[PDB]
Swiss-Prot record, chain A:
Location, primary (coarse class): cytoplasm
Annotated stretches, region: Leucine-zipper: 244-265
Record-listed Phosphothreonine modification sites: T257
Function: Component of the U5 snRNP complex that is required for spliceosome assembly and for pre-mRNA splicing. Involved in splicing pre-mRNA of the A1 cistron and other genes that are important for cell growth.
One Pfam match: AAR2_1st
Record keywords, A-Z: Cytoplasm, mRNA processing, mRNA splicing, Nucleus, Phosphoprotein
Modification sites for Phosphoserine: S236
Top-level taxon: Eukaryota
UniProt-recorded name of the protein: A1 cistron-splicing factor AAR2
Note: Present with 7330 molecules/cell in log phase SD medium.
CDD domains xref list: Aar2_C (cd13778), Aar2_N (cd13777)
From Swiss-Prot, chain B:
Subcellular localization, as worded in the UniProt entry: Nucleus
Effect listed in the UniProt record for changing D21N: Reduced growth at 30 degrees Celsius. Strongly reduced growth at 16 degrees Celsius
Annotated source species: Saccharomyces cerevisiae (strain ATCC 204508 / S288c) (Baker's yeast)
Boundaries of the shown chain within the full protein: 1836 to 2069 of 2413
Known outcome of mutating D22A: Reduced growth at 30 degrees Celsius. Strongly reduced growth at 16 degrees Celsius. Strongly reduced growth at 35 degrees Celsius
Known role: Functions as a scaffold that mediates the ordered assembly of spliceosomal proteins and snRNAs. Required for association of BRR2 with the spliceosomal U5 snRNP, and the subsequent assembly of the U4/U6-U5 tri-snRNP complex. Functions as a scaffold that positions spliceosomal U2, U5 and U6 snRNAs at splice sites on pre-mRNA substrates, so that splicing can occur. Interacts with both the 5' and the 3' splice site, as well as the branch region. Has a role in branch site-3' splice site selection. Associates with the branch site-3' splice 3'-exon region. Also has a role in cell cycle.
Superkingdom, natural source: Eukaryota
Written domain comment of the UniProt record: The MPN (JAB/Mov34) domain has structural similarity with deubiquitinating enzymes, but lacks the residues that would bind the catalytic metal ion. Contains a region with structural similarity to reverse transcriptase, presenting the classical thumb, fingers and palm architecture, but lacks enzyme activity, since the essential metal-binding residues are not conserved.
Subunit structure comment from the entry: Component of the U4/U6-U5 tri-snRNP complex composed of the U4, U6 and U5 snRNAs and at least PRP3, PRP4, PRP6, PRP8, PRP18, PRP31, PRP38, SNU13, SNU23, SNU66, SNU114, SPP381, SMB1, SMD1, SMD2, SMD3, SMX2, SMX3, LSM2, LSM3, LSM4, LSM5, LSM6, LSM7, LSM8, BRR2 and DIB1.
Note: Present with 468 molecules/cell in log phase SD medium.
Protein name: Pre-mRNA-splicing factor 8
Region annotation RNase H homology domain: where it falls in the sequence: 7-237
UniProt-reported outcome of changing D22N: Reduced growth at 30 degrees Celsius. Strongly reduced growth at 16 degrees Celsius
Amino acid sequence: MNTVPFTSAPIEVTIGIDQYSFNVKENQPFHGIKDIPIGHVHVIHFQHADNSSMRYGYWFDCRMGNFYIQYDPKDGLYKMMEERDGAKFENIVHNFKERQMMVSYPKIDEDDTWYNLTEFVQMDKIRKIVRKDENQFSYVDSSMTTVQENELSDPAHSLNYTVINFKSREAIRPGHEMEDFLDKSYYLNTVMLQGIFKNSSNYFGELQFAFLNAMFFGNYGSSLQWHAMIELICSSATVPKHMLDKLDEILYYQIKTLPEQYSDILLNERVWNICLYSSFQKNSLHNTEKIMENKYPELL
Amino acid sequence: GAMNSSNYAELFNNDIKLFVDDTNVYRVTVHKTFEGNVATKAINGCIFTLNPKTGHLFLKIIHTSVWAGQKRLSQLAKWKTAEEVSALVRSLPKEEQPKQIIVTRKAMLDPLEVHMLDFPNIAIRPTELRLPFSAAMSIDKLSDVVMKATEPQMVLFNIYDDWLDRISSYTAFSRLTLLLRALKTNEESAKMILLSDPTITIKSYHLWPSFTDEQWITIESQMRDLILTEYGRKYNV
């Protein structure tokens, strides 16, 4: 069970750790988060009390290094940093734990929510979508645009999601225009799965990461990416049986976790109606269709 | 974006453009079967691809053989239209290729855009105009070449005959849309107006009669009257 210590909390802020969140007061003696489950990626996220604009945060995996948060009064944000001195770090964490200045990652034993949302998400894949190679952790915020959004402007600060475009030479074989447009199986299976992602696990990992950036940061380009990756599967007549069963579980936990009050901005009516009621896979997502119909019948 | 009353003069500028109308591509007669069920029988169709500035009409005849053993024909008809328009553009020299293609029906946008991915600089546009190009098959010579076709065929016409010798493209297009609107609203009456005087004939190389400027004014008046009457009837006003 790993720890992310905080040097201090000089500004009032709502702190998120995965699906949990805590309010910290200006200069409250708060020194970090302990008992973080090993085996998963995690996200530690922030919304300042004085500017509820710019949700921002850090994807990390405690297996890759010793990470801490320190407020920078120049750039005006909580920054993740790596402590390279193992003995200094262990000594800092032990002191803060002894003084009980840390919140405990509040996981219920029964509760597989975080596993279910991050099953295919790998830190090494996150670091290719979010390029800052000198750090082992990845910064994301509300405003970062995607490579695809930028084609339609600072490349260093972009989300390099895999570009998906249903009306592109990549998506449409010369001579199979109608076939490839109405049945996206060759785009899904040959171009994306065999060609780019190599396997369904990497495809699901990007889909799950896109959803979590949409949910936690209100990142609009991430939301677009999540819906495009759903739509590419649902619009394919030929999908491996294990991928459909897994997609139904992935989407179920995403819809289950989504705050009820954000369904209006986080869910695209057209995509969900098409996917659940018109698409090739309209009858393949039983769990997802049932939670959507009981939680968001207005959208449909 | 969409072509409307506000940007109408754009049709007659020096940027090559084509209208595409897919209304007459998939044509059927509906009939009873021996068992008393209903069936369709396809008849020959056509794509109506028109340069509104020059009057050049690319009439691609759609022979019933293209539907043989195919399903969802009204969907396939849109894609076959976009395939044939794409093939026509690729067949034209670069300097003759259109800069825009305006589709008369919004359901043609996705099929044409996907077929034209190789031509990213050709704009595919819808229109808010309600153009009467469906009535092309009320022009006797166009109907005759479609119905007689025994295989896929492209036939080239000038839908304005020689009018551009005497009038602007704007005026020629207005005359064509009025004639086709009349033919669409009351074909029998429109055709009576156009042929009633046997001394005015259709040249072998033309579609419409050889009216003088003064006779065209009388004809155009008769077509306007036909359209308003019919409108009063349709709506009891």
